[PDB]
Amino acid sequence: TQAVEAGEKTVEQFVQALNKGDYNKAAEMTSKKAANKSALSEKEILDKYQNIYGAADVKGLQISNLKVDKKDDSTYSFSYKAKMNTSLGELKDLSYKGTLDRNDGQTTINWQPNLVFPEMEGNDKVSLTTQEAARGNIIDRNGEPLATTGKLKQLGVVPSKLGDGGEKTANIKAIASSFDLTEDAINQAISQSWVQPDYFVPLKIIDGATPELPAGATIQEVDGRYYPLGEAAAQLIGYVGDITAEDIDKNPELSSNGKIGRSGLEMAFDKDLRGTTGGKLSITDADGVEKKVLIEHEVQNGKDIKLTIDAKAQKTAFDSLGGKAGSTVATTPKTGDLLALASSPSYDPNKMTNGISQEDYKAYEENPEQPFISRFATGYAPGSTFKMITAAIGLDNGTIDPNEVLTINGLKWQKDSSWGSYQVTRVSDVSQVDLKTALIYSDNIYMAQETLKMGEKKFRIGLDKFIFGEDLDLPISMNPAQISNEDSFNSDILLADTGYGQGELLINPIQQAAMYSVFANNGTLVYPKLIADKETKDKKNVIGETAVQTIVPDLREVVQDVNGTAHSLSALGIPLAAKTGTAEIKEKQDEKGKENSFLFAFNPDNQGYMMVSMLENKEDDDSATKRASELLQYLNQNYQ
């Protein structure tokens, strides 16, 4: 028994060394090279595992049903089942055999070639054939390509057919002028250490028509990932990059010669889009005759993925932001279909996937507006647009009388002196303010007073009916919305600030469109939906239907009233219920305060669409409302 337990331990140490990819340590646990002992020395056992397991990308060795018994007084036999992962999938239930040598107080393994794979003898060989899987496509709600595989025209220069002095310098300036290239970039490209004078040095992927080709400039045709919307959907779709040795070490089933999603939906749906590698892993004898097929299956191309996105609305929403910082989310609020998820500024996903220079990537990374941010998935304070929610909560618990008229003097208000120098600020000095007037003029003082009168307890009861703290079932990385940092405000100022969408509220644009959908579903919250085939989810009785029938007519006046904050949208001549908003943010880079401009809008007649747009750190005289006319026209025409 004491020798049987020692034999079991050494087999477990041998498997563990192979499991951890430490082949040299596993070889040192073997007996000496002999006839009935080990078949090879330690160095060539190391080389056999390193060569064979490396060729099949063997990762992770797990065994089961280990049995060590006694044959002779010096040799103990062992057997166990085992499984491992390869570049062609999991290789399950492998029956391994062998014997253990016992001399002195050391138990070693009589190594044989059948310890690499179960049925190998002597000079048997291992072969691996693989067929690469074609990557699936990402399409919109009408089948338009968002991420597809196309034929790209690659511009390149052959430094041999270029020149020497006057001919070389003139041709480089001609190519740089005819293809929007820097003369220093072309010289740096052909001066790389890998370049030979007769080689084809690729420069960039050209899109559209091809101009004249000067001496040396030649166009070759290559296949690669292509994004038709470009930067208009770069944060949502993402990009693919070359698979690295580090990627294979983490997942050997990846194609060692293919692409992998690095961000966005390309990464979130990488498994479904990449498919499975097809091929065969077989064992042959010394004559190359097939002895045993270990793994074999055909190639399975990646499956397509259809989104709720409207490719026309996505491009319209992104273009409307004019390159400024901000985001826009468009939905069909009755089903939750995400028609558009625009984030601005953005980056070029085609440039990312077709090789980007360290300078262009550095410009993206050091842009203070940060184009890499997915602003539709980043939490923000919702701004004074949130007065809709506080009003609906106040109507439900009876704390807000729609006809009660408050008397507000000036633009600043304080509960008492305990607030110190802080005051809630409004933009319009209206003396007699009821609920309808407060929504039309966006009166933060009114709602701050109604929030304080309502109380934190009743306020949170209405807030808890929404989606605060919930994880949305979406293939987009995001954090749950929050009311504040803790379960209690512990501050009348924080309570009042939360009443009009400031405070410690953090809600991303997608979560905002979810909460605001109650006004298009008579108080029912409809969860947003990105995958077209998925089922509509909703949440009943978030706010009362009476509150909806009270607030939506007021939201019509935000557009139709001459002093409504969204009156410029009345020029469209379409039925609109809207609510503008602002959020004041303090920053340390600039001692002056920044603000975000918000716009909520939907069709109150048919509930066909709904949009939530925001400008982050807006320039002076800029707003989300002045940029929404084109998207509102398109959504109203095509979504009823």
Residue 420 neighbours by CB distance under 10 Å: 8
Q: Pick the closer one to Na ion by CB: 242 or 486.
A: 486
Binding flag, residue 596, Na ion (CB under 5 A): no
100 vs 506, which CB is nearer to Na ion? 506
Is 485 one of the binding residues for Na ion (CB under 5 A)? yes
Site of tokens 């009233």: 561
Closest by CA position to 68, among listed 2, 5, 117, 14: 5
Q: Which own/partner pairs from 309-312 qualify as long-range (CB within 8 Å, at least 24 positions apart)?
A: 309/140, 309/141, 309/146, 309/233, 309/236, 309/338, 309/339, 309/340, 309/341, 309/530, 310/140, 310/141, 310/142, 310/339, 310/340, 310/638, 311/140, 311/142, 311/144, 311/146, 311/228, 311/229, 311/233, 312/634
Q: Is 384 a catalytic residue?
A: yes
Among 429, 486, 587, 630, interactor with Na ion by CB under 5 A:
486
Least distance CB 442 / Na ion (angstroms): 3
- Tokens standing for residue 55: 């060729």
What secondary structure does DSSP assign to 213-225, as a single string? --TTEEEEEEEEE
| Smallest separation (angstroms) from Na ion to the CB of 579 | 8
Nearest distance, CB of residue 484 and Na ion, angstroms: 5
* Contact mark string toward Na ion, 555..594, x via CB under 5 A: ----------x--------------xx-------------
- Given the residues 384, 484, 597, 623, the one annotated as active site: 384
Given a contact cutoff of 8 angstroms between Cβ atoms, the answer to whether 463 and 489 are in contact is no
Q: State which residue, 219 or 427, has the beta carbon closest to Na ion.
A: 427
The footprint of Na ion on this chain (CB under 5 A) covers a number of residues equal to: 10
In 479-572, DSSP assigns E strands to 525-526, 538-539
Contact characters 451-480, Na ion, x per CB under 5 A: ----------------------------x-
Count Cβ atoms below 10 Å from residue 205 Cβ, excluding itself.
17
Given a contact cutoff of 8 angstroms between Cβ atoms, the answer to whether 135 and 240 are in contact is: yes
State the pairing for strand pair 138-139/305-306: parallel
Task: Quote the least distance from Cβ 478 to Na ion, whole Å.
Answer: 7
What is the Cα–Cα distance from 367 to 359, expressed in whole angstroms? 12
Does position 129 bind Na ion by CB under 5 A?
no
CB of 235 to Na ion, least distance (A): 16
Q: Are 343 and 327 in contact (CB under 8 A)?
A: yes
Which parts of 346-385 interact with Na ion (CB under 5 A)? 379
506 scored as a contact of Na ion (CB under 5 A): yes
Asked if 507 touches Na ion (CB under 5 A), the answer is no
Choose the binding region for Na ion from 272-280, 406-414, 503-511, 529-537 (rule: CB under 5 A): 503-511
Query: Which residues, 414 to 453, sit near Na ion by CB under 5 A?
Result: 442
For the window 378-417, what string marks contact with Na ion as x by the rule CB under 5 A?
A: -x--------------------------------------
Active site residues: 384
Question: Which residues of this protein are in contact with Na ion, per CB under 5 A?
Answer: 379, 442, 479, 484-486, 506, 565, 580-581
